[PDB]
Symmetry: C2
Subunit: 49 residues, 2 copies
């Protein structure tokens, strides 16, 4: 790698995030806030995704 090289020979850093969609206890989630529990009313829900 030279600083005077073109964009073809330019150093690029690659991160490949791999996710498993298999059914299991999920450990990593987004930053969404956790609401309270509303019972006996028709609600949308996202129960751990």
């Amino acid at each position: 790698f030279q600083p005077t090289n073109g964009v073809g020979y330019q150093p690029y850093r690659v991160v490949v995030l791999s996710f498993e969609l298999l059914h299991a206890p999920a450990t990593v989630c987004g930053p969404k806030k956790s609401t309270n529990l509303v019972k006996n009313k028709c609600v949308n829900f996202n129960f751990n995704g």
Copy 2:
């Protein structure tokens, strides 16, 4: 300026050092160790450059 630019389009920092050399007491000298004065003999000398 883009890091993906061509070889003619990168930033270049340029410092131009112009050495003013007036017939005057010189104040910018190189890193040369001085020698104590020896007189009355045929010697080389570097007096203020």
